[PDB]
Design an enzyme around this catalytic site. Structure first.
Site, PDB file in Angstrom:
ATOM      1  N   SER A 392      -2.809   4.126  -7.282  1.00  0.00           N
ATOM      2  CA  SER A 392      -3.536   3.899  -8.518  1.00  0.00           C
ATOM      3  C   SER A 392      -4.153   2.514  -8.453  1.00  0.00           C
ATOM      4  O   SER A 392      -3.436   1.525  -8.359  1.00  0.00           O
ATOM      5  CB  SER A 392      -2.567   4.007  -9.703  1.00  0.00           C
ATOM      6  OG  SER A 392      -1.937   5.277  -9.690  1.00  0.00           O
ATOM      7  N   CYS A 559       2.141   6.481 -16.763  1.00  0.00           N
ATOM      8  CA  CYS A 559       1.947   6.420 -15.316  1.00  0.00           C
ATOM      9  C   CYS A 559       3.260   6.142 -14.598  1.00  0.00           C
ATOM     10  O   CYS A 559       4.076   5.363 -15.075  1.00  0.00           O
ATOM     11  CB  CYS A 559       0.935   5.322 -14.984  1.00  0.00           C
ATOM     12  SG  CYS A 559       0.634   5.039 -13.203  1.00  0.00           S
ATOM     13  N   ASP A 604      -0.897   9.857 -15.246  1.00  0.00           N
ATOM     14  CA  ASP A 604      -1.184   9.503 -13.853  1.00  0.00           C
ATOM     15  C   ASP A 604       0.225   9.387 -13.287  1.00  0.00           C
ATOM     16  O   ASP A 604       0.735   8.290 -13.074  1.00  0.00           O
ATOM     17  CB  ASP A 604      -1.913   8.155 -13.726  1.00  0.00           C
ATOM     18  CG  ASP A 604      -2.178   7.760 -12.270  1.00  0.00           C
ATOM     19  OD1 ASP A 604      -2.485   6.574 -12.009  1.00  0.00           O
ATOM     20  OD2 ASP A 604      -2.083   8.630 -11.388  1.00  0.00           O
ATOM     21  N   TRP A 606       3.344  10.871 -10.461  1.00  0.00           N
ATOM     22  CA  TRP A 606       3.497  11.421  -9.121  1.00  0.00           C
ATOM     23  C   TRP A 606       4.943  11.404  -8.649  1.00  0.00           C
ATOM     24  O   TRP A 606       5.826  10.913  -9.340  1.00  0.00           O
ATOM     25  CB  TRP A 606       2.646  10.599  -8.149  1.00  0.00           C
ATOM     26  CG  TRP A 606       3.094   9.166  -8.040  1.00  0.00           C
ATOM     27  CD1 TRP A 606       4.126   8.684  -7.282  1.00  0.00           C
ATOM     28  CD2 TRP A 606       2.575   8.045  -8.767  1.00  0.00           C
ATOM     29  NE1 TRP A 606       4.283   7.338  -7.496  1.00  0.00           N
ATOM     30  CE2 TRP A 606       3.347   6.918  -8.404  1.00  0.00           C
ATOM     31  CE3 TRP A 606       1.534   7.884  -9.691  1.00  0.00           C
ATOM     32  CZ2 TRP A 606       3.114   5.642  -8.937  1.00  0.00           C
ATOM     33  CZ3 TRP A 606       1.301   6.616 -10.221  1.00  0.00           C
ATOM     34  CH2 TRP A 606       2.089   5.512  -9.842  1.00  0.00           C
TER      35      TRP A 606
HETATM   36  C1  LIG Z   1      -2.395  10.308  -7.859  1.00  0.00           C
HETATM   37  C2  LIG Z   1      -1.319   9.489  -7.157  1.00  0.00           C
HETATM   38  C3  LIG Z   1      -1.199   8.083  -7.407  1.00  0.00           C
HETATM   39  C4  LIG Z   1      -0.186   7.270  -6.752  1.00  0.00           C
HETATM   40  N1  LIG Z   1      -0.169   5.911  -7.068  1.00  0.00           N
HETATM   41  C5  LIG Z   1       0.819   5.171  -6.430  1.00  0.00           C
HETATM   42  C6  LIG Z   1       0.849   3.756  -6.749  1.00  0.00           C
HETATM   43  O1  LIG Z   1       0.064   3.184  -7.519  1.00  0.00           O
HETATM   44  N2  LIG Z   1       1.893   3.033  -6.085  1.00  0.00           N
HETATM   45  C7  LIG Z   1       2.825   3.513  -5.213  1.00  0.00           C
HETATM   46  O2  LIG Z   1       3.701   2.832  -4.681  1.00  0.00           O
HETATM   47  N3  LIG Z   1       2.764   4.848  -4.914  1.00  0.00           N
HETATM   48  C8  LIG Z   1       1.807   5.691  -5.483  1.00  0.00           C
HETATM   49  N4  LIG Z   1       1.758   7.062  -5.161  1.00  0.00           N
HETATM   50  C9  LIG Z   1       2.770   7.541  -4.164  1.00  0.00           C
HETATM   51  C10 LIG Z   1       1.849   7.290  -2.851  1.00  0.00           C
HETATM   52  O3  LIG Z   1       0.632   8.152  -2.701  1.00  0.00           O
HETATM   53  C11 LIG Z   1       2.771   7.680  -1.592  1.00  0.00           C
HETATM   54  O4  LIG Z   1       3.316   9.029  -1.705  1.00  0.00           O
HETATM   55  C12 LIG Z   1       3.963   6.741  -1.353  1.00  0.00           C
HETATM   56  O5  LIG Z   1       3.411   5.412  -1.237  1.00  0.00           O
HETATM   57  C13 LIG Z   1       4.752   7.061  -0.175  1.00  0.00           C
HETATM   58  O6  LIG Z   1       4.016   7.299   1.014  1.00  0.00           O
HETATM   59  P1  LIG Z   1       4.471   6.957   2.406  1.00  0.00           P
HETATM   60  O7  LIG Z   1       3.364   7.427   3.287  1.00  0.00           O
HETATM   61  O8  LIG Z   1       4.790   5.499   2.591  1.00  0.00           O
HETATM   62  O9  LIG Z   1       5.782   7.840   2.431  1.00  0.00           O
HETATM   63  P2  LIG Z   1       5.959   9.104   3.230  1.00  0.00           P
HETATM   64  O10 LIG Z   1       6.087   8.862   4.697  1.00  0.00           O
HETATM   65  O11 LIG Z   1       4.956  10.108   2.830  1.00  0.00           O
HETATM   66  O12 LIG Z   1       7.314   9.536   2.773  1.00  0.00           O
HETATM   67  C14 LIG Z   1       7.623   9.886   1.402  1.00  0.00           C
HETATM   68  C15 LIG Z   1       8.719  10.944   1.308  1.00  0.00           C
HETATM   69  O13 LIG Z   1       9.950  10.370   1.810  1.00  0.00           O
HETATM   70  C16 LIG Z   1      11.064  10.932   1.089  1.00  0.00           C
HETATM   71  N5  LIG Z   1      11.888   9.822   0.549  1.00  0.00           N
HETATM   72  C17 LIG Z   1      11.573   8.594  -0.022  1.00  0.00           C
HETATM   73  N6  LIG Z   1      12.669   7.836  -0.390  1.00  0.00           N
HETATM   74  C18 LIG Z   1      13.727   8.632  -0.030  1.00  0.00           C
HETATM   75  C19 LIG Z   1      15.171   8.486  -0.110  1.00  0.00           C
HETATM   76  N7  LIG Z   1      15.767   7.368  -0.630  1.00  0.00           N
HETATM   77  N8  LIG Z   1      15.910   9.563   0.382  1.00  0.00           N
HETATM   78  C20 LIG Z   1      15.435  10.721   0.924  1.00  0.00           C
HETATM   79  N9  LIG Z   1      14.087  10.966   1.054  1.00  0.00           N
HETATM   80  C21 LIG Z   1      13.271   9.878   0.556  1.00  0.00           C
HETATM   81  C22 LIG Z   1      10.496  11.920   0.058  1.00  0.00           C
HETATM   82  O14 LIG Z   1      10.613  13.282   0.561  1.00  0.00           O
HETATM   83  C23 LIG Z   1       9.082  11.383  -0.112  1.00  0.00           C
HETATM   84  O15 LIG Z   1       8.262  12.458  -0.543  1.00  0.00           O
HETATM   85  C24 LIG Z   1       0.745   7.940  -5.797  1.00  0.00           C
HETATM   86  C25 LIG Z   1       0.613   9.350  -5.556  1.00  0.00           C
HETATM   87  C26 LIG Z   1      -0.364  10.103  -6.193  1.00  0.00           C
HETATM   88  C27 LIG Z   1      -0.377  11.582  -5.834  1.00  0.00           C
END
Ligand SMILES: Cc1cc2nc3c(=O)[nH]c(=O)nc-3n(C[C@H](O)[C@H](O)[C@H](O)COP(=O)(O)OP(=O)(O)OC[C@H]3O[C@@H](n4cnc5c(N)ncnc54)[C@H](O)[C@@H]3O)c2cc1C
Ligand SMILES: NC(=O)c1ccc[n+]([C@@H]2O[C@H](COP(=O)([O-])OP(=O)(O)OC[C@H]3O[C@@H](n4cnc5c(N)ncnc54)[C@H](OP(=O)(O)O)[C@@H]3O)[C@@H](O)[C@H]2O)c1
Ligand SMILES: Cc1cc2nc3c(=O)[nH]c(=O)nc-3n(C[C@H](O)[C@H](O)[C@H](O)COP(=O)(O)O)c2cc1C
Ligand SMILES: [Ca+2]
Length: 607
Positions: A392, A559, A604, A606
């Site tokens: 966001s 949010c 907003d 997620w």
């Molecule tokens: C419309 C929208 C807006 C967003 N805005 C923001 C924002 O402003 N700020 C922000 O930080 N994020 C935001 N997100 C979340 C962001 O898009 C990512 O999903 C997030 O940053 C994680 O991505 P990653 O690639 O680092 O993690 P990934 O590699 O994709 O891994 C995430 C996955 O790891 C797992 N996981 C995480 N912690 C644990 C745990 N303790 N134990 C077991 N499994 C776990 C879950 O299955 C999770 O789905 C938003 C998502 C959407 C859809």
């Protein structure tokens, strides 16, 4: 070919599976269903509805045993994916008689959202209203549970229904055919090899607008700072320079970023596979008539594909496990993998526990199944494409027109499998050193917006990283005040675990309140006492003033966490309205849902 029906006739297909997808999941499901067709003597193809005209559906009866399937994901406010917008618009305006058309729909959604599987539900309802015949019930895939299990369960019953109605039977040849063939490019000029860019070759080096999903803009990281104290968790604030990109945005919009996989993970994959990652190759579709000539940009090296084009961090879906089994030389190991494709019983339990709950990524699976040694090229064909992550935007374009800000928490945790999983995009962003470091990005417009009238009060609820869009909102409201405009009350309900550990933008928010830009700064510290104290507790305490603002026409924004916070907050607003609005709880629910329809209650959220 303009008519998908003619395309089907010309290529001998009787089943066409359309996909409404934004991050590739629906497309993968459609592809998997299309390939299944052969197991029943039929022939299928998957297709992007945007590339065709769905009005041609009335011509399907020209193909014997024609069947059309729709795998549709739902997005913002229950709307269709961008590639399914024309189809949605056509469905809304048409009244064509679809008698003779036989269909089935599998919807991809998430129950934490307000309009669950709205797109799939609409398509299924509409096709029937138009006179088409439903072959099997609407599939309601829920990504909040386990979408993969929802899909394989529906897929099984689907084919049984197809066999029953069309009078066909399964072949039983689980031989599994490759979709692409490998060509090693031993003599290629370095300049003709993809190095991580999306779409056009050299588009990262030679940057020319317009910048979007297919042509992301490489934005320089001007700022990347830690927002919290302690090595506990890592919360960070990044500022990405979009000068000269012509990119436009407004507070409330999302910024999408294309990450790069951890090189340590890529290197280990190359070693355990016994492959030279620097080999440049191309994977070519054996179906010479498909517009999808390759699984990702090519030619390219295995290192590049495994770094920029393929997802190697997410726990694999069942088809990947089933197809890899044939490469496990140890009976026990090959048996474990094969079973995970089962829609029930031991096999399903194992998949959900050994792969999903244990959060095993591909390297972890290869490591914990040492006899598994698949050819790297087949693996590259099986792995899903690496997707962008959305954040966001935490800045106002009225104040920062040439910079897009991000507020994010880094994902990092220990698995029951004894491994340390690191979030794909957040670990990558964290490593971006300010002042050289580029982030491939683009902006995705949202309907989350400040009121048209500056005098309209705003009630913002965003604990944790959910505060992100509100930093932008406050900057803008402060800017409006500085422009001599009359601005209504601006209230922020924020929350964090402890005031001395994870209080984001403490100084900035305090200054905005002192300036008078932030009318109220209401913060709930959840762990500074025995019981939890959350934003909804503060909202309840402020019931009188909030009702007054709501009744006056204020806009509410929520949010952050969609799983529990959003629901708990919504429930509190129901109570505020039921208690002070002179109406029953059910009427209060209708009242809040109506605010959503009027654009006065925006989300907003997620997971
Ligand atoms: C419309 C929208 C807006 C967003 N805005 C923001 C924002 O402003 N700020 C922000 O930080 N994020 C935001 N997100 C979340 C962001 O898009 C990512 O999903 C997030 O940053 C994680 O991505 P990653 O690639 O680092 O993690 P990934 O590699 O994709 O891994 C995430 C996955 O790891 C797992 N996981 C995480 N912690 C644990 C745990 N303790 N134990 C077991 N499994 C776990 C879950 O299955 C999770 O789905 C938003 C998502 C959407 C859809
Ligand atoms: O970003 P981030 O993930 O890093 O945020 P986060 O720290 O996980 O959470 C942000 C804030 O939300 C609180 N919270 C948790 N469940 C909630 C709920 N159901 N309703 C309202 N507030 C809740 C947290 O308290 P707790 O973590 O103490 O539950 C915390 O103070
Ligand atoms: C910005 C955004 C908005 C979403 N909105 C909804 C929604 O309103 N209703 C719903 O049921 N699911 C919603 N989802 C969940 C998706 O429909 C689900 O993740 C689906 O698997 C995505 O398919 P895709 O990868 O093919 O795009 C949303 C996801 C995102 C990222
Ligand atoms: Ca207060």
């Amino acid at each position: 070919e303009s008519s998908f029906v003619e395309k089907m006739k010309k290529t001998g297909r009787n089943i066409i599976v359309f996909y409404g997808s934004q991050t590739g999941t629906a497309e993968e499901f459609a592809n998997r269903l299309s390939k299944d067709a052969h197991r029943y003597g039929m022939r299928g193809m998957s297709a992007d509805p945007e590339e065709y005209d769905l009005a041609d559906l009335s011509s399907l009866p020209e193909i014997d045993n024609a069947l059309v399937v729709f795998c549709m994901a739902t997005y913002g406010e229950g709307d269709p994916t961008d590639n399914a917008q024309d189809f949605y618009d056509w469905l809304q305006e048409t009244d064509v008689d679809l008698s003779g058309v036989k269909f089935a729909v599998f919807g991809l959604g998430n129950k934490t959202y307000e309009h669950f599987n709205a797109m799939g539900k609409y398509v299924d309802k509409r096709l029937e209203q138009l006179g088409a015949q439903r072959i099997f019930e609407l599939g309601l895939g829920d990504d909040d549970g386990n979408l993969e299990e929802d899909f394989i369960t529906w897929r099984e019953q689907f084919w049984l229904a197809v066999c029953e109605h069309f009078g066909v039977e399964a072949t039983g040849e689980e031989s599994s055919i490759r979709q692409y063939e490998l060509v090693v490019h031993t003599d290629i000029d370095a300049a003709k090899v993809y190095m991580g860019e999306m779409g056009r070759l050299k588009s990262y080096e030679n940057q020319k607008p317009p910048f979007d999903a297919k042509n992301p803009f490489l934005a320089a990281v001007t700022t990347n700072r830690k927002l919290n104290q302690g090595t506990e968790r890592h919360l960070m604030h990044l500022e990405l320079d979009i000068s000269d990109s012509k990119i436009r945005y407004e507070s409330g919009d999302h910024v999408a970023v294309y990450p790069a996989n951890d090189s340590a993970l890529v290197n280990q994959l190359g070693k355990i596979l016994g492959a030279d990652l620097d080999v440049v190759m191309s994977l070519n579709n054996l179906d010479e008539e498909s517009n999808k000539k390759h699984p990702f940009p090519c030619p390219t090296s295995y290192r590049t594909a495994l770094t920029y084009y393929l997802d190697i961090t997410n726990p694999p879906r069942t088809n990947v496990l089933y197809e890899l089994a044939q490469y496990a030389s140890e009976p026990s190991e090959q048996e474990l993998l094969r079973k995970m494709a089962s829609s029930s019983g031991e096999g399903k339990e194992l998949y959900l526990s050994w792969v999903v709950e244990a959060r095993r990524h591909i390297l972890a699976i290869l490591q914990d199944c040492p006899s598994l040694r698949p050819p790297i090229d087949h693996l590259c064909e099986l792995l899903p494409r690496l997707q962008a992550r959305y954040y966001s935007i935490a800045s106002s374009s009225k104040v920062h027109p040439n910079s897009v800000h991000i507020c994010a928490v880094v994902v990092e945790y220990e698995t029951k499998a004894g491994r340390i999983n690191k979030g794909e995009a957040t670990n990558w962003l964290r490593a971006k050193e300010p002042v050289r470091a580029l982030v491939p990005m683009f902006v995705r417009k949202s309907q989350f917006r400040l009121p048209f009238k500056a005098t309209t009060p705003v009630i913002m609820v965003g604990p944790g990283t959910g505060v992100a869009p509100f930093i932008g909102f406050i900057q803008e409201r402060a800017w409006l005040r500085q422009q001599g405009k009359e601005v209504g009350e601006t209230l922020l309900y924020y929350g964090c675990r402890r005031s001395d550990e994870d209080y984001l933008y403490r100084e900035e928010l305090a200054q905005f309140h002192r300036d008078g830009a932030l009318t109220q700064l209401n913060v709930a510290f959840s762990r500074e006492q025995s019981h939890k104290v959350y934003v909804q507790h503060l909202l309840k305490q402020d019931r009188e003033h909030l009702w007054k603002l709501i009744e006056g026409g204020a806009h509410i924004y929520v949010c952050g966490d969609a799983r529990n916070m959003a629901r708990d907050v919504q429930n509190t607003f129901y109570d505020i309205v039921a208690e002070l609005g002179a109406m029953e709880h059910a009427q209060a629910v209708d009242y809040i849902k109506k605010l959503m329809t009027k654009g006065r209650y925006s989300l907003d959220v997620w997971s």
